[PDB]
Amino acid sequence: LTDENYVDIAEKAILKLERNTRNRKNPDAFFLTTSKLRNLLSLTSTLFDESKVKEYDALLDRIAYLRVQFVYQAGREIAVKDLIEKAQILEALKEIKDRETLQRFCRYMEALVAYFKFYGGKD
Amino acid sequence: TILTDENYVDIAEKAILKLERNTRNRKNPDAFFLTTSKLRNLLSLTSTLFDESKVKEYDALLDRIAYLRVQFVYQAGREIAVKDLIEKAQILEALKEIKDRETLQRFCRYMEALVAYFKFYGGK
Amino acid sequence: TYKLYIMTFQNAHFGSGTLDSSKLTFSADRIFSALVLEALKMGKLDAFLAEANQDKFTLTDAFPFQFGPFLPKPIGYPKHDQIDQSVDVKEVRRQAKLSKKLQFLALENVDDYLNGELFENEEHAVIDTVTKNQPHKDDNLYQVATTRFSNDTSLYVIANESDLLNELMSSLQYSGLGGKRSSGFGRFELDIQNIPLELSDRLTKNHSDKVMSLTTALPVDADLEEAMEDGHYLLTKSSGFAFSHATNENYRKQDLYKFASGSTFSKTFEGQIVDVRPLDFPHAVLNYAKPLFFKLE
Amino acid sequence: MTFAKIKFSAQIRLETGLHIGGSDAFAAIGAIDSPVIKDPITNLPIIPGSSLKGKMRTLLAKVYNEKVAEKPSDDSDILSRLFGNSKDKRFKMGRLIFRDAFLSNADELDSLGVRSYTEVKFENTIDRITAEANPRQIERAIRNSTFDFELIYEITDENENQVEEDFKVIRDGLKLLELDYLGGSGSRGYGKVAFENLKATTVFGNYDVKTLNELLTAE
Amino acid sequence: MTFAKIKFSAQIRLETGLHIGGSDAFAAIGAIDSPVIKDPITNLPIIPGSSLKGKMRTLLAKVYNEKVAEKPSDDSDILSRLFGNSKDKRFKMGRLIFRDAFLSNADELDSLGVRSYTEVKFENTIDRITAEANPRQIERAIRNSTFDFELIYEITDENENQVEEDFKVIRDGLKLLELDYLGGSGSRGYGKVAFENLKATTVFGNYDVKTLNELLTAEV
Amino acid sequence: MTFAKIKFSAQIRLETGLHIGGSDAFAAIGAIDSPVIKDPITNLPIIPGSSLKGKMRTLLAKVYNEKVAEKPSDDSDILSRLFGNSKDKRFKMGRLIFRDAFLSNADELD
């Protein structure tokens, strides 16, 4: 799937990400803004923070809520839906069986965001 | 290839010399865009990595070398002088080349060297 | 006259009269004393003293052994006709002092040394005192000087191999030598090794031309006058307290002056094992002083 | 019974930082205030045999002396037989030969990327009335340093009963070192020590070590 | 009356961040921090026994002296008996041996996903006239860290009743540490500490601990 | 009065939102806000004792000094007595120990 060599995957996704090529300085010119993501990142991090002293079996409500806001926000803005595609996030979510898998996904989000900001994303 | 036992410090020094300086300051000499405060949380992680390279074995710390890379790009994303540093000093490449406790410890020391010569040649 | 008994120590203390003194090497009497003392607890004293009074029996001062054996600087040499170059005075006197400073040649170099070629010392060890304390007063605070061996330097001795001697030396290597042995010093690892022809060729106990003594030795009253007249020697003083279980009290054994290795004489003499016991002591106290020699040219 | 020499060997592990301390002018050099005793050629910390012997003896006096003794000549025959007694014809030398212990794992540490084999420990003192602090630096040999340990026991005039008792005394001695410290600032957490891979070996004569080895591995 | 050695063991849990530290010129080349004392091989925080002993002693002087002592030489026979007195022939060697405490739960923390064993606490000061703020970073060993604790007590020449008194003093000492801090910026919330799993064990000689174990599980 | 220790305990309830401390170390990757001081292990907010002591002291100086009090060294003996004064031999060690306060009611809120 993704695990343990996922930074390379996260990057490989992000360089593929959608570009507003119209801009006079449109380098890669990501269409996306950290502003658009914010809520679901605070959610993902609260999930990681929470899985440490709670159990994979009993968390899954919050993982529904995460998928939900993923889709909702995917609707509300185009560049988010694009991100979720090119980084196969929605495929990844359904794939989480262990607490090991879950923590891997949280890390994955972290990685995506890091490489977004690196490559000229606007926060 | 990039980081050799003979190599690292001389490279680190060269990098700190080639680093982006604020020429727009009439008052200041070669004065660095970069500032220790920007690096602090980053090289704290480097040091925790080196410190643990002694008490644990290479595979056990793969998670740590993951989170290092991330933080590096993240900070290079958030600060211009950081991106400049990790550019001129080939940092991310240098991580890619770490297969080994020998190589790893060398990288940690590399950061140490960079920072030393940063402060030496005008610092935060 | 048979084998090189090579003791290799890390820590040793060979006191030259004080606990805050220490030496590179020890002499025949010390290890003979030590051998005697080991035989005595093994049971086998009587048998060892048997062996020791054999003309065949051979013991020598210890010497530096560094990838091969060393020897003592021949006292008396080089003579005047081999030592007087045309160089200025400052040089002659520097190399004269360099020649006095010298202790031990490697075998390879001894003939050179005699023929006039210059050599200086090598670092075989470092000696330092350390202070130790006893935590019951400021009245016990003392320094013990140790010889700390460096540069793959062992000590060796030439001895005539026998089943008994071999056994006693193997046991000694867990008893230590000289030293505060109880307290950490002196232990060694033994290697008995064939003696290079280049050396064994030049060993005698009887010979009527010039020889250097390899043992700190005292001639028999009958040979003494001769060895002193045509001799070149340094007299060393053997002194100390006799070690023994005989009595609680400690008595100085009798001071004995001997000729140092290698003093040089015009010919070999017969030597003694001296009884240096305190007058009217329960048992003999033995100072081994019987020379093995090395010939010159 | 016949003459024999048994070698007690172990690796001393430093469980906490150890300070014995420099007298040798080489090792006395004031580049730090309170230096540690070091082997002059390697400049590594060294555990002097005199330290081990001394400490183990004074520990064992608390157990095995019927009457507490002012001077070491007044120690019990059971201690005197092992450590030696200068004023008693029978025991002028004990049956034990200690050896200076040297740093074994220098190479292990060099490989791990350790730099110095000594830490400099900062401490201070608080005036009880003025609360002002007077600070203090003192060297320790780093913890998890290991030292090759060797002690020789000589069997001479002992009855097998006697060598057994001697072995009891030696095992008590080592345990007592483990439940105490090797001379340092011990009260304040310094000299803790462990004997690892503790083993007896007959290096001369015949003695049988099987039951001793068992008894050492269990205490 | 006989000879015996009792080992007091516990796990010290840090209730708040702890700061001992203080090698400034031997510090990590890293960044500004007031560094904390660390075991050189593992670079982990350490609780030096010197610290435990010192603090516990000066706490206990407030209880057990019943006349203020200018110097630690002037402490009561009960304290000198335990902690040692260099200027009294009787107590030159104290019955207690404190031990450097080391981080036990590194594995617990690695499981909980911690990325360092020390936090940097950011603080500031406000000028009381100018209202200007001067900031300050200072290192602490992280909060839910635990350390193996070991203290050795030696019975020689003491009335079994003297052993009783000594035990009282030890328990008072530990409780006083719990109701105080381990030297740090203590007044500002540092160095709160707890003794968990506190138990005595006779590791040499023979002594009966059952009653003591009861009593020190009671008083912590 | 022979030695004794009195422990003042309470629960601090936040009547409004509270914001104290923190830095770009404790930060979440893509946090855009000014973060808060947190316990590193649980990543929960913590109320640092340094903060409580600070605020309480500077407020109390306005009441109890009846003096300018340019620096905390210059506070009155009654405040120095309690919070401690680095430059006075008598008060070098203070009678109050504030403690980092930790979140109780996580379960109530959940």
Place this chain on the structure above:
Amino acid sequence: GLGIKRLAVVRLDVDDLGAAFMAGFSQQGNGQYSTLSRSATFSRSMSLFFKVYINQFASDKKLSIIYAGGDDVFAIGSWQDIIAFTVELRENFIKWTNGKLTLSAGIGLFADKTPISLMAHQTGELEEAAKGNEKDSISLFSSDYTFKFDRFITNVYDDKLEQIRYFFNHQDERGKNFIYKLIELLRNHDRMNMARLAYYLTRLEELTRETDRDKFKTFKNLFYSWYTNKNDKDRKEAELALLLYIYEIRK
């Protein structure tokens, strides 16, 4: 209550004195100036210097001259005064001799109550190390610290040590601690430790008061100069002056 509690010994010797007595007058002319009378007068010069004038060099210094002659001078005292005595004696000797003759000396440093035999012996060894250079040297406290007299005087004693003294007499405990780091780094000279040297040097510069900030800038870069020279002479002198300083302040 300042200064290390040690007492010192000095042993010092004229260099190639034998050579002077016998042929020092042979160079000029061609040996026409080598007479008996000339040599006699030489002997008187050295008697005078070593048996009369020596006492004056000792005056007002806490020390005792036990043996004194062109052959051998032995003096024991408090340490700072012994080093002062050695230096005063030598520079008088160079002037007296018009530069044509030198001394070597070595200076032992010991704790109270070490026995006489020991000090004499260990200080004799130190002196021979000193004669171990091209014979114009002085060895202080360890064979490793062995310098041509000329550059110990000029460079260690009254340059590097005066600079060090000046900066650190201003610094507090926290800065004075850095001396230990500097020492260490001097003993472990390697490429990377040049980096570390620079780091703690600028760290010190940071902790130094603004009055000395300019002078200390100059000094800091000078130090790193010594430490970077491929020639090791300046950093040796550095190690020894930092030592002198630490001994000088210790309580």
